[PDB]
Design a protein around this ligand. Structure first.
Ligand SMILES: CCCCC[C@H](O)/C=C/[C@@H]1[C@@H](C/C=C\CCCC(=O)O)[C@H](Cl)C[C@H]1O
Lengths: 216, 211
């Protein structure tokens, strides 16, 4: 199959910036009929992808003229002349010249802001959940930037992997940060047989993790 | 105007099949291609195949040959995607797209497919109280289906709130919501999470009290 390689994976931009993003195909995508079916899409959360550019360089009807596409052969580029807030989202390229049709993996345009360490908070199981026989330990890693982050759970000094579920917010509309929630679920029995519970946040803003803990 | 109307969200039992529809208008039905595209939550776009109602011609991405079947009903300008023997990996949004040969495509709004054996179940809501600012939370566990609506203090507390996307575990959804307030406001004032679940027609409150 034709491999579509998009770069960069993510692009932080400020409003008014020039943006340029690239799509390279693993082989030529000139169709036998002479056309190059290369398209660019912008997708926002919860919406269908919206067509921006078709046949390499043609703007789809209604698309702002700040968007432009170019390229030839295996080498394609989408440019935005002065980014606006509605341009933030994920951009995909698509080749329609050789079946199976194939998409790039996406380039995320996100809003740039100052790097920020997460605010980390840990919560032991509620007595209500315990009475019901369950035990969830919740860790919030809030308002950090950039979006990449890692969480590690420790029970009595030992790393725990099973029973951990994570969830991430989209970039915050007001402060441009990201947040993450991590939940460690246990049976009530196992939870009462240990003492210290620890969630560790590793983020680029520091060399050492931010560590939060409690004891039963 | 070219328009594609896709069928509503589907809740599908594991192992069962489901048939999604895309109903077209605004053009000569037999002269446009229909494509289907899959998108798993938080992931990229995958092409499933193309179908040309005007001849019955089709092509599947080999990755989907044992999973997807295209058919059409010309008498209603509808094309169908049937997905067989659903697994967790089949949970996704499915888009249809239509175009004439050498012309730009029009996309439908997508159909969400969720695989679970669960029946309608209201959430259990648990307070998250800590062991200049303070962070509180609510854990919303074991409900089906999506969505729930979480508010704090009946909506009067909206800033500093993060409600996280739900995750499906053992066929039921769990999510958490955090709120951050000045320490001068809690516990001296009431902070309550409210959780509405339309499918079960329930709404419950949980006041956050110190441990
Ligand atoms: C989600 C995909 C949307 C469509 C992508 C692109 O716009 C379509 C490209 C088409 C190309 C690929 C699509 C279908 C193959 C049909 C071959 C046939 O006519 O037998 C054909 Cl060759 C012409 C061109 O219009």
């Amino acid at each position: 199959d034709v491999l579509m390689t998009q770069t960069p994976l993510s692009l932080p931009v400020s409003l008014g910036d020039q943006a340029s993003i690239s799509c390279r195909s693993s082989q030529s995508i000139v169709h036998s009929n002479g056309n190059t079916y290369l398209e660019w899409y912008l997708q926002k959360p919860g919406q269908s992808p919206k067509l921006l550019i078709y046949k390499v360089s043609n703007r789809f009807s209604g698309v702002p003229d700040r968007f432009s596409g170019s390229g030839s052969g295996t080498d394609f580029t989408l440019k935005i002349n002065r980014v606006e807030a509605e341009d933030l989202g994920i951009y995909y390229c698509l080749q329609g010249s050789h079946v199976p049709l194939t998409f790039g993996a996406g380039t995320t345009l996100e809003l740039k802001r100052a790097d920020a360490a997460p605010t980390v908070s840990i919560f032991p199981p509620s007595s209500e959940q315990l009475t019901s026989g369950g035990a969830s330990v919740v860790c919030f890693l809030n308002n950090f930037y950039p979006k990449d982050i890692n969480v590690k759970w420790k029970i009595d000094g030992s790393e725990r992997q099973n029973g951990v579920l994570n969830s991430w917010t989209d970039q915050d509309s007001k402060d441009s940060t990201y947040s993450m929630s991590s939940t460690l679920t246990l049976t009530k029995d196992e939870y009462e047989r240990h003492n210290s519970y620890t969630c560790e946040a590793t983020h680029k803003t520091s060399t050492s993790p931010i560590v939060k803990s409690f004891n039963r | 105007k070219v328009q594609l109307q896709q069928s509503g969200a589907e809740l599908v039992k594991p192992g069962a099949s489901v048939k999604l529809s895309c109903k077209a208008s605004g053009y000569t039905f037999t002269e446009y291609f229909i494509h289907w595209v899959k998108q798993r939550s938080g992931q990229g776009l995958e092409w499933i195949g193309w179908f040309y109602p005007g001849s019955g011609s089709l092509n599947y991405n080999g990755k989907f040959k044992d999973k997807a079947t295209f058919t059409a009903d010309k008498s209603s300008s509808t094309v169908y995607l049937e997905l067989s023997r659903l697994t967790s990996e089949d949970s996704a949004v499915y888009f249809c797209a239509s175009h004439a040969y050498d012309k730009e495509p029009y996309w439908g709004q997508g159909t969400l497919v969720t695989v679970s054996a669960a029946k309608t179940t209201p959430p259990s809501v648990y307070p998250l109280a800590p062991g200049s600012m303070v962070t509180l939370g609510c854990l919303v566990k074991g409900y089906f289906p999506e969505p729930v609506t979480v508010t704090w203090n009946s909506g009067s507390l909206s800033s500093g709130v993060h409600t996280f996307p739900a995750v499906l575990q053992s066929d039921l959804y769990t999510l958490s919501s955090s709120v951050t307030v000045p320490s001068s406001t809690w516990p001296s004032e009431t902070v309550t999470c409210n959780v509405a679940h339309p499918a079960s027609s329930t709404k419950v409150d949980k006041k956050i009290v110190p441990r």
